[PDB]
Structure formats: C-alpha cells, structure tokens
Design a protein around this ligand. Structure first.
Ligand code: 5DT
Ligand code: ZN
Length: 257
C-alpha cells in the first residue's frame, strides 16, 4: 500500500507507520556549516574484495542488488562504527528529472540520485534482528550527479530491462560494488532511520561527501523501470525518494576539515 505516488506517498506514511514523525528520522538536510568536524572519528573501512552478489530484484519501490551475507565477505567498519557490519544489499533512489532524486540534501542541494549500501551489525546475528536495535544497521549513502558515465554501474543498468516490473528478479553474480565508490571516503555521519517503511530508527548514516558521476543515458535507464507488475498499467519508477525530515535533537559530525 505505501508508495511514492499521488495518494500513498511520504506525507501519508505516518498513518500506518507512526514512527514517521519520530525523533531520529531520515533523510535529513546536511547543513555543512553546522556539522562539526570530529577528530575522534576513524577512517572508514570498506572491505568489499570478497563481496558475493547474487541477484537483482525489482521490489516495486526500487531495485535491490542482493549479496551473500552468511559470512564476513563484504564489511563496513571503523568510521563512527563499533564492531563489524555486513553488506546485505544496495539500491538507489532517483528523480524524474536530474534536478531531484537524492534523499539527503547538502545545504538544500538535491542530487540526481542516491545510492544506499545497506549493512547489518554482526553482533545481532541477522538483518531481521539488527533492525530492532538502535545500532543495528550502517547505511553508506553516495550521491550521484549526471555527467560522465560510471563504468562500474553499467552492468547494473544493462540488466534493468530484465527486471522491468514489480516482483521480477535476475541472476546477478560477480558484481563488484567497489566500482560504485568515489575516490574520497570523507563523510558526514548521524543517527537516523530506514527511509522506507517500516522507517525503523536503527541506522547509523554515513554519507560520503564526494558524489559519483553517472551519464544521462545511465540514469535514463533507471527511469524506464516500473513500479507496477507485469500486465498492469505502466507507472514509471521515478521519484522514489523521501524528502528531508526534521533534524530534531541530533548532531551531524564530519570526518574532515
Ligand atoms: N532507503 S534505506 O537505505 O534507508 C533502506 C534500508 F536501510 C534498509 F535496511 C532496507 S531493508 C529494511 C526494510 C524492512 C522491511 C520490513 C521489516 C523490517 C525492515 C530498505 F528497504 C531501505 N529502503 C530501500 C528502498 C528504496 C526505495 C524504495 C523502496 C525501498
Ligand atoms: Zn535507500
């Protein structure tokens, strides 16, 4: 029932998911002048050499590239995190137009899209248990702007026609998520939530400062996906982002400068 459309979009979510109006909701506007450099933060450690991608799924809201997380193979640690977070899936949010699409904003600036690499804290044993904990997830957020193509994204763009509609999936092995990272790992971090229902307040957000560039042709292919299932009227999958939510009693910390 929840979605992005005219009648079931983010402004409606609170009726099924009252935590929508909670104290640590995401995304947020990153006010770069008020984020405080925190010299006690660590460099982030992104270890994806052993990543095992399995499958790509259109779930009717976005597409997820799913990983094998039954062993320590693709982990995020360091930075603001204690302990070890496994990679479980990544997905994107994007706009109908290049001027919008990202969920976090930077001094109110919207990017064309935003990548979310989702990881769960191994101390809780699995994803379903982790999301019930305030430190259960670490999401690495990366902005996309339109300019030169991102070679490491092409294998993703090229399988999308095979998962056009809701519920379709395709084998997606041997995908290396290192090809989606920018050069710098400088980041902002704050405590937040999943940006989709159930909107659980279980996420340490780590949002990279440096955006990656993707081509206009790459993002156009994202916008040919469908929210609807096969043999339903076409509703293009665009504008699947939640707008910035109030920061409330939170501090965003910078790893740099
Ligand atoms: N967008 S996000 O990075 O904050 C995110 C996340 F961190 C997750 F762990 C997950 S999986 C957690 C979902 C869940 C469902 C039922 C019960 C418990 C938990 C996300 F789906 C998304 N959302 C993905 C998405 C994007 C666009 C449309 C629909 C879903
Ligand atoms: Zn997301």
């Amino acid at each position: 029932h929840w979605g992005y459309g005219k009648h079931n979009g983010p402004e409606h979510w609170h009726k099924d998911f009252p935590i929508a109006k909670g104290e640590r909701q995401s995304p947020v506007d990153i006010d770069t002048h008020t984020a405080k450099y925190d010299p006690s933060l660590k460099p982030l450690s992104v270890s994806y050499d052993q990543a095992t991608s399995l499958r790509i799924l259109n779930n009717g809201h976005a597409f997820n590239v799913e990983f094998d997380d039954s062993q320590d193979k693709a982990v995020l640690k360091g930075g603001p995190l204690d302990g070890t977070y496994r990679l479980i899936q990544f997905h994107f949010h994007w706009g109908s137009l290049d001027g919008q699409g990202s969920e976090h904003t930077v001094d109110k600036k919207k990017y064309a899209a935003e990548l979310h690499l989702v990881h769960w804290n191994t101390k809780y044993g699995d994803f379903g248990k982790a999301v019930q904990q305030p430190d259960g997830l670490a999401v690495l957020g990366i902005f996309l702007k339109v300019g030169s193509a991102k070679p490491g994204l092409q294998k993703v763009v090229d399988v999308l026609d095979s998962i056009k509609t809701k519920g379709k999936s395709a084998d997606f092995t041997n995908f290396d998520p290192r090809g989606l990272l920018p050069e710098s790992l400088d980041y902002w971090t704050y405590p937040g939530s999943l940006t989709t229902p159930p909107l659980l307040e279980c996420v340490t957000w780590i949002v990279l400062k440096e955006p990656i560039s993707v081509s206009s042709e790459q993002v156009l292919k994202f916008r040919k996906l469908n929210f609807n299932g096969e043999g339903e009227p076409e509703e293009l999958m665009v504008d699947n982002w939640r707008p910035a939510q109030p920061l409330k009693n939170r501090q965003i910390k910078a790893s740099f400068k």
